Structure formats: C-alpha cells, structure tokens
Ligand binder design. Structure first.
Ligand SMILES: *[C@@H]1O[C@H](CO[C@@H]2O[C@@H](C)[C@@H](O)[C@@H](O)[C@@H]2O)[C@@H](O[C@@H]2O[C@H](CO)[C@@H](O[C@H]3O[C@H](CO[C@H]4O[C@H](CO)[C@@H](O)[C@H](O)[C@@H]4O)[C@@H](O)[C@H](O[C@H]4O[C@H](CO)[C@@H](O)[C@H](O)[C@@H]4O)[C@@H]3O)[C@H](O)[C@H]2NC(C)=O)[C@H](O)[C@H]1NC(C)=O
Ligand SMILES: *[C@@H]1O[C@H](CO[C@@H]2O[C@@H](C)[C@@H](O)[C@@H](O)[C@@H]2O)[C@@H](O[C@@H]2O[C@H](CO)[C@@H](O[C@H]3O[C@H](CO[C@H]4O[C@H](CO)[C@@H](O)[C@H](O)[C@@H]4O)[C@@H](O)[C@H](O[C@H]4O[C@H](CO)[C@@H](O)[C@H](O)[C@@H]4O)[C@@H]3O)[C@H](O)[C@H]2NC(C)=O)[C@H](O)[C@H]1NC(C)=O
Ligand SMILES: *[C@@H]1O[C@H](CO[C@@H]2O[C@@H](C)[C@@H](O)[C@@H](O)[C@@H]2O)[C@@H](O[C@@H]2O[C@H](CO)[C@@H](O[C@H]3O[C@H](CO[C@H]4O[C@H](CO)[C@@H](O)[C@H](O)[C@@H]4O)[C@@H](O)[C@H](O[C@H]4O[C@H](CO)[C@@H](O)[C@H](O)[C@@H]4O)[C@@H]3O)[C@H](O)[C@H]2NC(C)=O)[C@H](O)[C@H]1NC(C)=O
Ligand code: HEM
Ligand code: HEM
Ligand code: HEM
Ligand code: HEM
Ligand code: HEM
Ligand code: HEM
Ligand code: HEM
Ligand code: HEM
Ligand code: HEM
Ligand code: CA
Ligand code: CA
Lengths: 150, 146, 147, 144, 146, 147, 147, 146, 144
C-alpha cells in the first residue's frame, strides 16, 4: 500500500517498545542493543571498525555498553516523538548530523541494522508487529540518513 | 500418541479458541504473526501470497485458507479415513514447494501459543503436541513427526 | 458482493449449522445431500469427481472432498463483509476449478438451486432473499471464466 | 546526605514515574526548562542554536528531549558505577566547550526536582535522595 | 538455547502472567491442577504436603513455595552466579527425594499451559521451553533438559 | 495476624519495591543493605552465614541467599490475608531457622528494626504502624521457640 | 490514500482554521499568503492567474479565487475517509487543472511546500507526517499527468 | 432584502446545520433527495454525474461540490466584491447548460427544508428566502429571484 | 518576530479560546493581574481608584473586566489596521494622563501571555505570535 508510518502504526510501535523498555534499569535496553550490534557485526564485519572509540570489538566493555545505552536512548527519543512530528524532525536532523561525515557510516549500514532489529525484537518483544515496526523504523532512519552516502 | 480421548479434548479446545465471525480472522492473524516472530525467515516462503504486507487481501486470504484447513482437519480427527485423505490432499499442495520440515515444528509451537492463549489455563498442551504430530506427519511425512 | 445487513443474516444463519463445534460427520452428511442433488440435476457433472472416489460417496476420499468444499463455502460466507479479502479468496477458489476441465457455468447455477433447496431444511427460518443476494455474487466469482 | 544504594533505587523508581513512557514528557520537560530560565534568564544565551528564546519551538523541544534523555541514562545507570562514570564522561565532553558554571548546574538540579515533584506530588517526593544523586550526576558532568 | 533475549522475554511474560496478590494463589492452584491432570500418579509424591487435599493450607503453602521458587529463579535469569548458586540450592533439596526426572518434563508442560493461558496469544512458547530446561537441569542434572 | 486493611497497605507498599517485574540486582542490593545493617546491630550473627559465603557479600552464593530471604518475606506478605496458609507458611519457615546453628530470638528483633529502618528509604510514605501490625506477628511465628 | 487515523488528525487540525463558522476575510487572508509564497517559490507561475486578476490580490475576483481553492482543499480533506468519492473528486479537480494553460507538476510540489510551511503557523501542534500521508496522495491525483 | 443582519443569521444557521466531517455528506444527500422528490424530472438533468444512482461516487462528488459551493458563497455573504465575482463564476458554469430557472426555486425550497430540519425551530425562513434569492439571481440572472 | 497576517489569525483563535464566553473570565483576569502586581508591586499605586490593593474586590474585578475588554477589541481588530489604530488611539488617550512606562506595558504583556498559556496550555501556546502582536498593541497605546 502506502508504506508510510501511520498514526496507528506509531501507537503500536510505542506499545511494542514501551512494554519491553525498562524505565528503571539498563539491563533490558543494554541487552537489546548489544544483541542488535552483535547481529550487525556478524552480517557486516567491516562495521565493527566504525566503533573503535567505543570499543566495538568488546561489546561487554564499559565503553561499548555506554554507547549501546546512547543508541537505545536515541531510538527511544524518536519512537516517543513519532507522536509529535514537528519536534521529531528537529531530533532526527540532530541525529543525522551526529552520523554525518563519518567514514564508513552510510545508508547501507542503516538498512543492515534495520534487519538486525527485525531479528532481535521478536525474540524479546511480545506481540511484535514486524510490519508496523519496519514502516516506522524506516520513517526514523530516513530522517537520520538524509545527508548520508548510499 | 494422540488416542481418541486426546483427539476429542483437542476438538473441544479448538472449537472454543477458534470462535465465530471475525474472531477467526483475529485468531488467524495472531497465529501467523507468532509464526513469523518465531522464525522471521519463514516469511520469505510466502512471497506468492504477498507476505510483505500481512494485512493485504492476498495474505489475509491465505490466513483464512490455513485456519480453514486446521478447522476441517481437526473436525475429522475422529474419522481416520476422511482424515488421512485430506492430509494427503494437503501434502500434495505442500510438496512442490520443497519445504524444510523444521518450519512445521515452528508452526505447531505457534498454534499452541495461539490456541492456549485464547483458550486459557486449561489448555492441554501434551494432547496438542501429540495430535499436532499427526497433522504434521501427514502433511510432510518427515518421521521427525513420528 | 452483498450489503452488510444481508451478509449478517447469511453469516448468522450459516453459523447455526456450520462452525468449529460442528463435527465432520454432520459436515459430510450435508455434503453428500448437496452433491447428490447436484448430480441429479446435472448427471453429466458426476464424472468430474472420479478423483475423489465419487463412485462410493461414503468413502474417506469423498468425505474429505465435501468437507473442504463446505469449508470453502464457509470461508466465503464469513468474509462477505470484507470484499477485499473475499475478492482474493474467490479468485483463488476459481483458480482451483478452472484448473479442472469439464466444468460448466450451468453447473454452478445448478449448485445455486441445490443450496436454495437444501439449506431451508437445515437452517432455522431460512431467508431466501438475503441468501440469494449474497450467494449469487459469490457463486459468480468462483465460476468466473467457466464455459 | 549521600546518594547510597537505597537512594539510587528510590530515584530510579520516582524518575520512572515522573518521566514515564512519553506522553507526559513534553509537559514534563517544558515545566523544567520554564523553571530554569525563570530562575536564570541569563543562561538562555547559551542556547542560541536551539531557540532558547522560545522554549515552545520544536527546536527547543528537541533539545529538552535530548537533555531528559541524558538524565534518564544517568538515572538508569546509577546502580552501575562503571558504565555510569563512562556516561558522565560523555556528557562532560558534550558540555566542555560551553562554559557551564557549577551555579547553572545547581539551577537545573532544582528545576529537575520541582518538575519531578510536580509530576509525582510532594506527598512522595524524596528531596534528600534526589539532591544527593543529582549532585553525583552533575558533579560528574563537570569532570568533578 | 535460552540466550539473554529469551530470558528477558520470559521474565516479562512471567511477571504479567504471575500477577500480584491473591491472583498468585490462583495461578498456582492452576499450575498444580494441570500437573496432577497430566500425570495423576505424581500426586502421591506430595503426601508430605497433604496433596490429598489441594485446598488445604499445607498444600497451599507448598504451592506458594514453588511458584515463589519459580519467581526468584526467573528473576535471577540475568545473573548466572546467583542463578546457578540458587539452582544448586534447589537441587540439594530435591536430590534426597529420588524424584523421577520425567516429572519435571510434565511440570514444564503444565507451566507453559498456565502461563500461556493467563498471558494470552503472544506467549513465547519456544523461549519458554528453552529457558525452562535451564531451570529443570539446574534442579535435576538430567541431560534430558539439554 | 493483622487487619485486612493493614495487610492491604503492606502488600501495596511492598509491591512498590518488590514484584515479578523487578530485576534481581535491585533484589540483592536491598538484600545486602538489610544484612549489613543486621551485622552492625548484632555482629555476632554474621558468622551464621559463613555457609552462604557471607565472607563475600557480592558472591552468587550470598546474592542467592538474600534473594530467597526476600522471596520468603514476599511470600509471607502476599498471604497476610490467608491466615490458614500463612500459619502453615510461617511454621515451615520457622522450621528452617530452628534447625540452624546459633539463632537467638533477639536476632529477629534486630532484623525487625532493620526492616523498619531500611524500608522507609525505599517505600513512598512507608507506614510503620501497618507494617508493625502485620510483621511483628509474622516475626514471632518465625522466631517462636528459639533462644 | 491515507490512514483513517491520519485522516482524523488532518480533518481535526484543518477544521481548527477552516469551517463554516469562519469569516471569508480570514479565508482569503490565508489564501493570499499561500499564493504569495507560491509566487516567491515559482514566480513563473504567477502569470497563470492573470485571469482571476492576480495583478491585484485584494480584488474580489482574486479573493473569490483563493476562496474556491480553499473550499476545494476543504472538500478534499473532509472526504479523506471516503476513498471512492475522493477519487472521483480529485479526478474532477484534476480535470480543472489539466485544461488550464501552463501547469507543470512541479508547481504542485511547490504548493505542497507552501502548505507545509503556512499551515503550522495557523494550526495548533500541526502534524507534518499525518498531513504528508494524506495530502501527498491527493496532490499526485490533482497533478497526475501534467508536465 | 437580505441585509447584513439576515446574512449573518444565515451564516450562523448554515454553519450549525451544515456541520463537520461525514455529517456533511448526509446533509447533502438529504438536500438532493428532497430536490428530486419535489421535482422528479430534474433528476434527468444530472446524467453527467450519474444521478441515476445517488449512492455512487460520481454523484457524491457532485453533491460535495454543490454544498461546497453553497458554503463558500454563504461565507462571502459579507463581501460583495468576492461574492458577486464568485456568483459570476458559478453563473458561467450553469449558463451553457440551458437550465430552466424554475428549478432554482425548487432547489431553494429543498435547501430550506434541509437546513430547517437540521437546525431546528429557530430556523429563520424569511431571512433564508431573501438571501437565497441573491444566490439564485447571481447564478441565473432571472428576475424571478428579485 | 513579526505580527503578520498569520500571527494575527493565531492570536485571534487562541485569545478566543482563553477569553471564552465569560464563565472563566474572572479567573482569567485574576490570574493575569495577580501576576502583574507580583512582578511589579510598585505599579498598584496607580490603581488607587479601583482598589489595586485588593484585586479580590468588585471594584478591581470591574477594572480587570474593562482591561480584558480592551485587549479583546484590539485582538478582534488585529486584521483591520484602520479601525485597529483608531482603537489604539482611544486606549492611548485613556492612559495619557497616568504616566505608564514602557516597562510596565511589557509587564502586563508577559502577564497576559502567561494567563493565556495557563488557559489553553503550553502545548499550543504560540509565544512568537503573541509577543509580536502584543508589541503592536501596547506600542500603539503608547502613541508609539
Ligand atoms: C464405501 O465405503 C464404505 C467405507 O469403507 C471405507 O472407505 C473406503 C474408501 C475404503 O478405504 C475402505 O477400505 C473403508 O472400509 C464401505 O463400508 C465398509 O465396508 C467394510 C467392508 O470391507 C466394512 O467392514 C467389514 O469388514 C471388516 C474387516 O474384514 C476383514 O477382517 C475380517 C477379520 O475380522 C476378515 O474375516 C475379512 O475377510 C476381512 O479381511 C469386518 O470386521 C466387518 O464385519 C464384522 O461384523 C459382521 C457383522 O455385521 C460380522 O458378521 C463379521 O464376522 C465381523 O465381525 C465388516 O463386515 C466397514 O465396516 C464398512 N464401513 C462402515 C463405516 O460401515 C462400503 O462398502 C463402500 N462401498 C462399496 C460397496 O465399496
Ligand atoms: C567477591 O566477588 C566479587 C564479584 O565477583 C563474582 O563473585 C566471586 C565470588 C567470583 O565467583 C567471581 O567469578 C564473580 O564474578 C569480586 O569482584 C569481582 O572480581 C572480578 C575479578 O576477576 C572483577 O573483574 C575485573 O576483571 C575482569 C577480568 O580481568 C582479567 O581479564 C581482563 C580482560 O577483560 C584483563 O584485561 C585483566 O588484566 C584480567 O586478567 C574484567 O571483567 C574487568 O576488568 C576491566 O574493566 C574494568 C572496569 O570495570 C577496568 O577498570 C579494567 O582495567 C578492565 O578493563 C573487571 O573489572 C569484577 O569486576 C569484580 N566485580 C565488581 C562489581 O567489581 C570480589 O573481588 C570478591 N571478593 C573477594 C576478595 O574474593
Ligand atoms: C486593489 O483593490 C483594492 C481593494 O479595492 C477593491 O478592489 C478593487 C479591484 C476595486 O474593485 C474596488 O472598488 C474594491 O473596493 C484597492 O484598494 C482599495 O481602493 C479604494 C480606492 O477607492 C480605497 O478607498 C479609500 O477611499 C474610499 C473612497 O474615496 C473617495 O471617497 C471619500 C469619501 O468617503 C473621499 O473623502 C475621497 O476623497 C475619495 O474621493 C474611502 O472608502 C476610504 O477613504 C477614507 O478612509 C481612510 C481610512 O481607511 C482615510 O485615511 C481617508 O482619508 C478617507 O477618510 C478608503 O481609504 C480602499 O480603502 C482600498 N482598500 C484598502 C483595504 O485599503 C487597491 O488600490 C487595488 N489596487 C490597484 C492599484 O488597483
Ligand atoms: C537507527 C538506529 C540508530 C540510532 C538510534 C543511533 C544512535 C546513535 C547515537 C545516539 C549516537 C551517539 C551520539 C553522541 O552522543 O555523540 C550514535 C553514535 C554513532 N553511531 Fe549511531 N545510531 C543508529 C544507527 C547507526 C548505524 C546503522 C551506524 C553505522 C554503521 C551508526 C554509527 C554510529 C557511530 C560510528 C557513532 C559514533 C560512536 C562514538 O561515539 O564513537 N549508527 N548513534
Ligand atoms: C500443518 C499446518 C498447516 C496447514 C493446515 C496448512 C494449510 C495450507 C493451506 C490450506 C494452503 C492453501 C492451499 C491452496 O488452496 O492452494 C496452504 C498453502 C501453503 N502453505 Fe501451508 N499449511 C500448514 C503449514 C505450513 C507450513 C509450516 C509452511 C511453511 C513455512 C506452509 C507453507 C505453505 C505455502 C508456501 C503455501 C502456498 C501459498 C500459496 O502460494 O498459495 N504451510 N497451507
Ligand atoms: C459454489 C460452491 C462451490 C464451492 C465453495 C467449491 C469449493 C471447492 C474447493 C474448496 C475445492 C478444493 C480445492 C483444493 O483444495 O484444491 C473444490 C474442488 C473441486 N470442485 Fe468445487 N466448489 C463449489 C462448486 C463446484 C461445482 C458446481 C463443481 C462442478 C460441477 C465443482 C467441481 C470441483 C472439482 C471437480 C474439484 C476438484 C476435486 C478434486 O480435487 O479431485 N465445484 N471445490
Ligand atoms: C542536569 C544535567 C544535564 C544533562 C543531563 C544535560 C544533557 C545534555 C544533552 C544530552 C545535550 C545534547 C548534546 C548533543 O547531542 O550535542 C546537552 C546540550 C547542552 N547543554 Fe546540557 N545537560 C545538563 C545540564 C546543563 C546545564 C546546567 C547547562 C547550562 C546552563 C547546559 C547547557 C547545554 C548547552 C548549551 C547545550 C548545547 C545545545 C546545543 O546543541 O546547541 N546543560 N545537554
Ligand atoms: C522446576 C520446577 C520446580 C521448582 C521451582 C520447585 C521448587 C520447590 C521448592 C521451593 C520447594 C520447597 C523447599 C523447602 O523450602 O523445603 C520444593 C519442594 C518439593 N518439591 Fe519441588 N520444585 C519444582 C519441581 C518439582 C517436581 C517436578 C517434583 C516432583 C514430582 C517436586 C517435588 C517436590 C517435593 C516432594 C518437595 C517437598 C515438599 C515438602 O516440603 O514435603 N518439585 N520444590
Ligand atoms: C523475617 C526475616 C527473615 C526471612 C523472611 C528469612 C528467610 C529465610 C529463608 C527463605 C531462608 C532459606 C531457607 C532454605 O531454603 O533452606 C533463610 C535461611 C537462613 N536464615 Fe533467615 N530469614 C529471616 C531472618 C533471619 C534472621 C534474623 C536470621 C538470623 C541471624 C536468619 C538466619 C538464617 C540462616 C542462618 C539461614 C541459613 C543460611 C544457609 O543456607 O546457610 N534469618 N532465611
Ligand atoms: C492542492 C492545491 C490546489 C487546490 C485545492 C486547487 C483548487 C482549485 C480550484 C477549486 C480551482 C477553481 C476551479 C473552477 O471552479 O473552475 C482552481 C483553479 C485554478 N488553479 Fe488550482 N488548486 C490547487 C493548486 C494549484 C496550483 C499549484 C496551480 C498552479 C500554479 C493551480 C492553478 C490553477 C489555475 C491556473 C486555475 C484557474 C484559475 C482561473 O479561473 O483563471 N492550482 N484550483
Ligand atoms: C444555488 C444553488 C446551486 C449551487 C450553489 C450550484 C453549484 C454548482 C457547482 C459548484 C457545480 C460544479 C461546477 C464544476 O466544478 O464544474 C455545479 C454543477 C452543476 N450544476 Fe449546480 N448549483 C446550484 C443549483 C443547480 C440547479 C438548480 C441545477 C439544475 C437543475 C444545477 C445543475 C448543475 C449541473 C447540470 C452541473 C454540472 C454537473 C457535472 O459536472 O456534470 N445546479 N453546480
Ligand atoms: C495591555 C494593554 C492595556 C489595555 C488593553 C488596557 C486597558 C485599559 C482600559 C480599557 C481601562 C479603562 C479606561 C476607562 O474606562 O477609563 C484602563 C485603565 C487604566 N489602565 Fe490600562 N490597559 C493596558 C495596560 C496598562 C498598563 C501597562 C498600566 C500600567 C501599569 C495600565 C494602567 C491603567 C490605569 C492606571 C487605568 C485607570 C484605572 C482607573 O479607572 O482608575 N494599563 N486600561
Ligand atoms: Ca549540586
Ligand atoms: Ca513589548
């Protein structure tokens, strides 16, 4: 059909997310991100290099963990703002400039991680709707990669 | 083994969990969402029914045919001759697509979660595991369902 | 297909005699009465079912046939208020018939009269108009392309 | 008072209650930043790039979103000193070239406390626990 | 199996299914009712807690202790150190009773039926089978749960 | 035991900081604070836990100990309104402490003071009277007989 | 077209600034801002309105033009949830622009940017995604075929 | 007639009677139903918009366009410049159709019935008759509406 | 920012929402003047004749009524420069012999904005639009 991220898809995505999201401890978030990156790496070996500053070769180090926590925080911020797109646009631009001009960071890698999330979420999220999720995950990455290389 | 008693318990539990009207479409959508979440890669085997958009008429038609099969198949549990004929009829439709038997294991797991989730705490899982084996074995042949 | 109010009557009247709690026996029993009636109106159509052992209608092969038939009719009725899916469902059903040769449009017209005659004997206070309004289009969709 | 294990648990629960899942987040962040800029109107000059002159704009709302997302990470990590201190170092570097005064940090602290109290009510607000753990947080964002 | 994702999934669903207050005793009464139904003989194994009468306080206390056990174990699913240390503890309590390991297979089935019925259709059966094993293994040592 | 309205408050407050949706980390974090305090009050009682590796309170063995201690407390609390089962539950727990080496009733009096001191830091508007009315009775049952 | 929940938001936001209880003055005031902006973006398109007296945008002829333009937009919006009629409504509107002299599809892309730029100034918490999902489809229909 | 007071009155009542969203299509379906009932022959004048079937999208679009016309006209009731300029526009669209002016008298009656029924007892019929004329005159030029 | 045609429409709608039909007008005006006199207690001396010492009195309530009635006229006329400027001149003469400082005008502006925000919520309050059009209004009441 349209493939656009609809108001109802957004409601559902906030549900898929809010339920799994631990608002008190990093245990859940952390576990979800690390798993996302393991998958990302195993499908894209060359991608681990882009994370040397955050110790991407050591997913359990204090530095990569803190980074996973930041990625999970960026996604959460975007999933929440799906409800208020005016502000969402400003937040997705900021994220965009945070990934822009980074050697190795391209749209290809975002499509990759998109599939990593599609493989991770169902394992941890109950009542996962892969369709609504991907339609809005893509809405979010599109804003994050507006000025990135293919 | 799926003796007669288990077949009856299973027909009774299915009837209750399957329901009437649109409740069936909901049950089906749940069954299939669970299958693709249990094995995200099985989704590719259904390009022919447009599994890219699970809420498309093509896939929804596919969801209805499947639970429709489950229904008629479960309703014949008590008559061996009718049962085996229809299971063969189904195998005939599933062979030319060369399917890995393990997918049918996932399907059964999803079937249990859906029926039990809809039926409640008195869901008889052992009886369901046993009798589902008869359907699986009949459709695939793989003695993994022996 | 048919209106929401007509569809509702048909669905409710069908659910009376067909549903998950209805055993297979009752099912092929309705099946046999329906195909026997079909054969008597169009004797020539009978041979089309030698693959389901129409020779002995009380056989496992012919019982399973009528069961999937009625299951196919059930599916169609229950989706009367979802024209999008029902359209796709009827197209698929037709594909499974056009695939078989010998079938004629007049055989589906005959099935129509069989149902109109059989159902009132099963259903409480059958409604011939609601059923005609919904079955006709359903029958046409399945027999689409038949000579 | 000290930000001990018990105070860190209280703060986590009360922060989760106040911050919530997202519906009341906008109002939550607005209340906080309306408080900061009223107590220290001078400070809005540091927010020229995110329209600090108008906290009703999407641009500022996105910033407020980021900030609270920062507080959330720290609250979530309060019980993991190792990763916590790593995150405080990240926030430190994000504020290094901006000259924030320990006074402005304290302002935002009070603003954060009032907003949380405003969200969960004075009846349950644990001031001692929040001040101690907020000191631990800002203190770390300022290197020390 | 039973990686960290499925462990978190199982903790989520257990939390929901298990519930608060008095709904706890209900969930437990159902768990134990399914067990004795799936394997009527196992009932004789609990004469020490008056299994003779499931509504008796002695057997309610037992029910409470067991689900209490399941809950603390599941809560430690993320910390192997405390998990194994506790599974080891639970092991030393069951060993001297010469319990047939096959009854832990029955227990798990009852558990899935009870959690699935109370949680609904999104119940993750594969995750539950895989993570229950870990539990039964830590208590039994039987490679049956491998 | 304690009133039904008291029990309701205790259950509510307890489920604030303890329930199936809480991570074990926080569980044992509360555990260690509880025992460290019991130790400082009665240091003579620390040795009793040398078996669960009280030497290192960050060990899986000790973490698991506080975990089951808290699950027991939780179990007791959630049954406050079922006098019959709770009586039976406490007797069992009571049996698990009698058979243990070096346990004086006064240690459960200290523990009580620790709970009345630790809980208010974790619970919103902690209610000491309601908690006293419900736990004191429980404590006497789990500590009835010993020195 | 667009989701039923999206359509609901768009309709709600639009009726905030446009409804039968609003004076025409405000109607054309919004009209002139919309076109002045379209002109500044694509000045080449201004001439196309020389017929409605685009020369003087404060004229009754031009005011009436923006009025009917907005009524059309309103008409389109209020039917977002009636796919059948809206399809027919857009085709008609689409016909009223094809027959017109000098119209390139790119002008409707500019107009889109103008609406996405003017509306947020008039509407409380304007929702660009919901509006994009509902209008882009509409715009393609009214601008499908042209240069 | 149709001074400024009655024009404001008519705008008030039209706003209320007309309504928002889907209630718009209902009001229009009623307007057009009354028209064809008051003068069954006029129906043949709209074969170009499939008046043959009032529930068809082609005729719904027409209904929408007409009430949309009534609404924009009524909204400009206070600015003669834009009003006449628009009535002139509507005139150039109806002239080439050789429509009998007497049908605009029927239209107005249907309009009053529809607005009055939906607005209630405080419907101002005299104001409506007087201000409708202005509209029919601007579209027809027939002094019948003088 | 400028008080353009669009900002004038927004202000009109939001003012109509806040001011309403009259039921919440008393509370609306009280909130506003409680704000003014707290930010500038000195100014109440100019209201001796209308009991500025007690804004709870009928006399003051009538004045607050008049003032908001003045703001309403201006908001209503924002899209009619001609009659607008004529009305601003009337208000100008009603304040000419009272020595109001551009500072006090700005005070009342902020007070008005907070009251409107308080009535419709920060979620929709358009600060840019209101400040621009309030500048246009007071600026005109002060001659220029
Ligand atoms: C139409 O189909 C039905 C159903 O038949 C089934 O479906 C078909 C598709 C095929 O797949 C069939 O294989 C399948 O049965 C037909 O009715 C059935 O007819 C059979 C006859 O074969 C009935 O069963 C009779 O035979 C059994 C078994 O006989 C064998 O074993 C005994 C040893 O005990 C040997 O002695 C035989 O030589 C042989 O090897 C037999 O047990 C029954 O007889 C018992 O009862 C009698 C009293 O009535 C006693 O006098 C006997 O001593 C004995 O105790 C049966 O006579 C089978 O029950 C029916 N099915 C039903 C549901 O009634 C139908 O005939 C067919 N149409 C035609 C004409 O082809
Ligand atoms: C009481 O127990 C605790 C908890 O430990 C647990 O319980 C015990 C009873 C045992 O059963 C343990 O197996 C169980 O985990 C004891 O504290 C823990 O002790 C370990 C000591 O191994 C701490 O681990 C640190 O070191 C490990 C591994 O170090 C080796 O490998 C790394 C490669 O990754 C090499 O680079 C090293 O040279 C070394 O050979 C590692 O995971 C961490 O080290 C990194 O991270 C630090 C930041 O956290 C950096 O500062 C380091 O430079 C390095 O990059 C660990 O820090 C483990 O963390 C503690 N637990 C905590 C929470 O601190 C405790 O000692 C014991 N009491 C006694 C006296 O027995
Ligand atoms: C674009 O159109 C606009 C709008 O005008 C409309 O559209 C046109 C296409 C025509 O169809 C017009 O008929 C239609 O109204 C044009 O701006 C308007 O232009 C008129 C010019 O007549 C403005 O009217 C001013 O003057 C009239 C009448 O003036 C005569 O009569 C008075 C007696 O009342 C004598 O005293 C004069 O000496 C003169 O002979 C009058 O209504 C107003 O004048 C008074 O009020 C002013 C305050 O507003 C005072 O400052 C004056 O001193 C005086 O007391 C009118 O101001 C009409 O107002 C404007 N519209 C606006 C909103 O300003 C525009 O010019 C045209 N573009 C071009 C270049 O063609
Ligand atoms: C849509 C999912 C993603 C989200 C929500 C996300 C979010 C974030 C956030 C919040 C940061 C930290 C920014 C800061 O504090 O400075 C970050 C950093 C980064 N991201 Fe992503 N990211 C996503 C996908 C990706 C992908 C697909 C790649 C590329 C392969 C990538 C590469 C990076 C790199 C290289 C950094 C810098 C790490 C560092 O601090 O050294 N990100 N991302
Ligand atoms: C044991 C339970 C199952 C039942 C009762 C069942 C039933 C059905 C039915 C009724 C159809 C439609 C046949 C037709 O009319 O053309 C069908 C089609 C199909 N099934 Fe199954 N099925 C089952 C399991 C599976 C599994 C586990 C897979 C594999 C992942 C599978 C793959 C397919 C495919 C690929 C089609 C063809 C879709 C198409 O293009 O039309 N089925 N199944
Ligand atoms: C409108 C009512 C009818 C319905 C709902 C219906 C439904 C079905 C269904 C579901 C199948 C099985 C498809 C498959 O799984 O491959 C089938 C097969 C078949 N139908 Fe029909 N059918 C209807 C009428 C007819 C009529 C009127 C004729 C012709 C005289 C007919 C002849 C056949 C034949 C020859 C087969 C193939 C049997 C075989 O596999 O050997 N059907 N029908
Ligand atoms: C209470 C603890 C605080 C936290 C958790 C916090 C968090 C953050 C975060 C997450 C960002 C965005 C960084 C980026 O993506 O580049 C940020 C930016 C900023 N913060 Fe803070 N902050 C805190 C306190 C303060 C204080 C006290 C001030 C000063 C008055 C301040 C001034 C700024 C400025 C000027 C920026 C840059 C805005 C821009 O992007 O232009 N922050 N802060
Ligand atoms: C994995 C699931 C199981 C868990 C978590 C579990 C847990 C427990 C716990 C906590 C106790 C009480 C220990 C005490 O305080 O003294 C207990 C007792 C007991 N369990 Fe289990 N158990 C499980 C499965 C089984 C099974 C399958 C059997 C055997 C058929 C069994 C037989 C017993 C018996 C006989 C007792 C002693 C009751 C008594 O006090 O007289 N348990 N179990
Ligand atoms: C009212 C609060 C208390 C509760 C709920 C509680 C609960 C428990 C539980 C559930 C166990 C584990 C039983 C088993 O599985 O075998 C346990 C063990 C034990 N408790 Fe307590 N207890 C409490 C207070 C105390 C106090 C005050 C002392 C005394 C110093 C104490 C000393 C012990 C000892 C020595 C063990 C055995 C540890 C081991 O396995 O080596 N308990 N308690
Ligand atoms: C999506 C927004 C738009 C809507 C809703 C819209 C609507 C309308 C309507 C209702 C008319 C009057 C039709 C009649 O009664 O004959 C009209 C006329 C016209 N429109 Fe549009 N329009 C839109 C965008 C555009 C754009 C982008 C252009 C291009 C520059 C354009 C150019 C015209 C022209 C040239 C006329 C004829 C004016 C005349 O009578 O001389 N429109 N439009
Ligand atoms: C005063 C009330 C009336 C108003 C406001 C009105 C308005 C309209 C409008 C806006 C259109 C669509 C123009 C377009 O976009 O192409 C239209 C079309 C039309 N009107 Fe009217 N009209 C009125 C009365 C009548 C009457 C009384 C008749 C005749 C019996 C009539 C006959 C037609 C016809 C035949 C069309 C063309 C339909 C088509 O597209 O094929 N109208 N009218
Ligand atoms: C925001 C714009 C303002 C509006 C619309 C406004 C409006 C009014 C109105 C309608 C009156 C009543 C005049 C009469 O009937 O005689 C009035 C009186 C007055 N205003 Fe304002 N005013 C505004 C700002 C201010 C400010 C900033 C001050 C000064 C602090 C002020 C001081 C006064 C005083 C002293 C009176 C006379 C009270 C009396 O009758 O004794 N006004 N104003
Ligand atoms: Ca501080
Ligand atoms: Ca000012």
């Amino acid at each position: 059909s349209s493939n656009s991220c609809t108001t109802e898809d957004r409601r559902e995505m906030q549900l898929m997310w809010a339920n799994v999201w631990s608002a008190q401890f990093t245990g859940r978030r952390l576990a979800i991100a690390q798993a996302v990156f393991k998958d990302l790496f195993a499908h894209v070996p060359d991608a681990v290099g882009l994370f040397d500053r955050v110790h991407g070769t050591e997913i359990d180090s204090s530095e990569f963990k803190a980074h996973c926590i930041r990625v999970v925080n960026g996604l959460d911020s975007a999933i929440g703002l799906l409800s208020d797109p005016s502000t969402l646009n400003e937040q997705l631009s900021h994220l965009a400039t945070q990934h822009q001009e980074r050697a190795g960071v391209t749209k290809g890698g975002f499509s990759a991680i998109a599939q990593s999330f599609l493989r991770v979420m169902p394992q941890v999220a109950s009542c996962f709707n892969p369709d609504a999720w991907s339609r809005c995950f893509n809405r979010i990455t599109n804003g994050m990669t507006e000025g990135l290389a293919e | 083994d799926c003796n007669i008693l288990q077949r009856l318990k299973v027909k009774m539990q299915w009837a209750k969990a399957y329901g009437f009207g649109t409740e069936r479409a909901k049950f089906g959508n749940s069954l299939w969402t669970s299958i693709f979440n249990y094995a995200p890669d099985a989704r590719d085997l259904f390009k022919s029914v447009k599994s890219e958009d699970m809420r498309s008429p093509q896939f929804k038609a596919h969801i209805a045919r499947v639970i429709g099969g489950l229904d008629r198949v479960i309703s014949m549990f008590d008559n061996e001759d009718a049962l085996n004929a229809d299971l063969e009829h189904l195998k005939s439709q599933h062979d030319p697509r060369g399917l890995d038997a393990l997918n049918f294991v996932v399907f059964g797991k999803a079937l249990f979660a859906t029926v039990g989730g809809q039926f409640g705490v008195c869901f008889d899982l052992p009886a369901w595991e046993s009798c589902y084996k008869v359907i699986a074995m009949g459709i695939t042949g793989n003695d993994m369902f022996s | 297909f048919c209106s929401e109010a007509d569809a509702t009557i048909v669905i409710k009247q069908w659910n009376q005699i067909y549903n998950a709690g209805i055993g297979a026996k009752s099912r092929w029993t309705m099946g046999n009465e329906i195909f026997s009636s079909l054969f008597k109106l169009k004797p020539e159509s009978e041979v089309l079912f030698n693959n389901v052992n129409v020779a002995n209608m009380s056989s496992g092969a012919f019982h399973a046939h009528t069961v999937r038939v009625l299951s196919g009719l059930d599916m169609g009725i229950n989706y009367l208020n979802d024209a999008g899916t029902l359209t796709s469902l009827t197209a698929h059903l037709a594909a499974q018939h056009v695939a078989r040769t010998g079938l004629k449009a007049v055989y589906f017209d005959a099935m129509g009269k069989v149902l109109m005659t059989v159902l009132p004997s099963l259903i409480d206070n059958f409604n011939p108009d609601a059923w005609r309004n919904c079955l006709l289009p359903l029958k046409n969709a399945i027999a689409k392309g038949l000579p | 008072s000290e930000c001990g294990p018990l105070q860190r648990l209280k703060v986590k629960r009360q922060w989760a209650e106040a911050y919530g899942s997202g519906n009341g987040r906008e109002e939550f962040g607005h209340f906080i930043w309306a408080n900061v800029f009223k107590v220290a109107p001078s400070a809005r000059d540091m927010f020229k790039r995110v329209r600090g002159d108008n906290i009703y704009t999407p641009a500022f709302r996105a910033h407020a979103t980021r900030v609270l997302g920062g507080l959330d990470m720290c609250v979530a990590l309060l019980d993991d000193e190792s990763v916590l201190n790593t995150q405080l170092a990240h926030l430190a570097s994000q504020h290094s070239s901006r000259g924030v005064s320990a006074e402005q940090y304290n302002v935002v602290e009070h603003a954060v406390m009032m907003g949380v109290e405003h969200e969960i009510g004075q009846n349950v607000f644990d001031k001692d626990a929040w001040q101690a753990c907020l000191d631990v947080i800002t203190s770390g964002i300022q290197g020390n």
